[PDB]
Every structure is written in structure tokens, then in C-alpha cells.
Amino acid sequence: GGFIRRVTNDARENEMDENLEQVSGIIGNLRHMALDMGNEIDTQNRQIDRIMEKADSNKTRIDEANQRATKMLG
């Protein structure tokens, strides 16, 4: 592959490439992980919002049903 400018074609710089070979690949992974990470965050953020809307409807109805229930008690 060759990630670097080779000078002393010695194995010491042969290890640099090997190393950069792996780093490059792992960055690829990191990119997709980041992308997926971002979309899950979005999707969930929206759901959370939805979840939240239902939470109100429910609490409202609950509190109201509560009011009734409370009057029928005294």
C-alpha cells in the first residue's frame, strides 16, 4: 500500500506502514460507527419527543380522571 514517503527502506519504516495500514482501516470503522451513532441518536431523539407527547396526554387525562375520582369521594 504505502502510506509514507520511504527513505531508508529499512524495516523500521516498514513497520510504520503496517501500523498506518491498520489505523486507516480502523478509522473507516470509526467513521461508520460515528455515522450509525448519529442516526440512532436522531431517531431516538425524535421518539423521545413522541414518547413525551404521549406522556402529557396521559398525565393530563390522569390528573383529570383524578379530579373526578376525588370529587366522587367527598
Binding site: I4, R5, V7, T8, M16, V23, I27, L30, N58, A65
Partner: protein, 72 residues
């Protein structure tokens, strides 16, 4: 004619430049990791409060029901 040193110095500059970036990126991932891990703590709190609320609503229903039935 050791211009070769020039190159080696350039490559070196490139390599440490990359390590620095891989550094920002590395911490960046550590932060997200710790951030959502922390948020998990907020989500399961929400999970139990809702589980509870569901239980209470269910109970409330069958009690209000038994109420209606006890009317006769």
C-alpha cells in the same frame, strides 16, 4: 546530499500531525461513551417511573371497576 533528512522530517511532521488528530478523535469517542453511559442512568430511571405509573393505572382501572360493580 542528505535531503533525505528533509523528507524524514516531513514524514515525521505528517505522522505526529495524524497522531494529534487521532488524539482528538480518540477523546471524542471516550466522551460520547461516557455521555450516553451516563444518560443510561437517566433512561432506566424513566423506565421504572413509567413501569410504576403503568402499574398504578392498571390498578386504578380494576379498582374503579370494582367500584362500579359494588354499585347494586
Amino acid at each position: 546530499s542528505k535531503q533525505a533528512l528533509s523528507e524524514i522530517e516531513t514524514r515525521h511532521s505528517e505522522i505526529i500531525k495524524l497522531e494529534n488528530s487521532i488524539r482528538e478523535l480518540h477523546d471524542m469517542f471516550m466522551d460520547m461513551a461516557m455521555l450516553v453511559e451516563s444518560q443510561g442512568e437517566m433512561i432506566d430511571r424513566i423506565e421504572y417511573n413509567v413501569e410504576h405509573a403503568v402499574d398504578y393505572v392498571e390498578r386504578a382501572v380494576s379498582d374503579t371497576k370494582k367500584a362500579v360493580k359494588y354499585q347494586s
